[PDB]
Symmetry: C3
Subunit: 76 residues, 3 copies
């Protein structure tokens, strides 16, 4: 066991990468839905009003970099 | 120290599992709220309109599998 | 290599902390946008209706604790 540690660590890294990739994908969908429905509300109102748009550009790019960074922790 | 490495790794794994479980729980709530409020908007409009529903089925199941996968990286 | 394992592990921990911090930040923004737009909808309706508010207090605090817990897995 030093080889077994490295195996479990690489294995965990793969799971962590999937989790943040998936999280990033979910946030994109949330942004699109919230913003579509905000614009629909604004349009209906035209036919206060203070709606807000979601912008998660920074967060989504940051999650992508996190998955990238994890790639560099793998053990050959 | 090889025992201390394994301890810190198991400890980190526990934190990672909690994080993705919590993230998964939050996404479920976001989906429910966004969709409830989209349906409320559609109903009000009936009384363009292009509202969108959130479906994060794939992402939430994927997060569950990630937490499952992490379980398999523990060191006895 | 035992030093290389510890280095990659610390490196991965840093990435994991960033990911959950970023995720936590994104959820805060999602909560604010969804709730602002729910209140806007309620106001427009006043001028069923069953809108829902998002509260991710537990999840956001939990993510903060996860980042805290990860800090304690670092190897000197």
């Amino acid at each position: 066991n030093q080889k077994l540690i490295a195996n479990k660590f690489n294995q965990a890294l793969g799971a962590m990468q999937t989790g943040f990739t998936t999280t990033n994908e979910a946030f994109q969908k949330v942004q699109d839905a919230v913003n579509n429905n905000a614009q629909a509300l604004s349009k209906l109102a035209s036919e206060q009003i203070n709606t807000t748009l979601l912008d998660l550009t920074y967060e989504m790019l940051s999650l992508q970099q996190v998955v990238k960074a994890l790639n560099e922790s793998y053990i050959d």
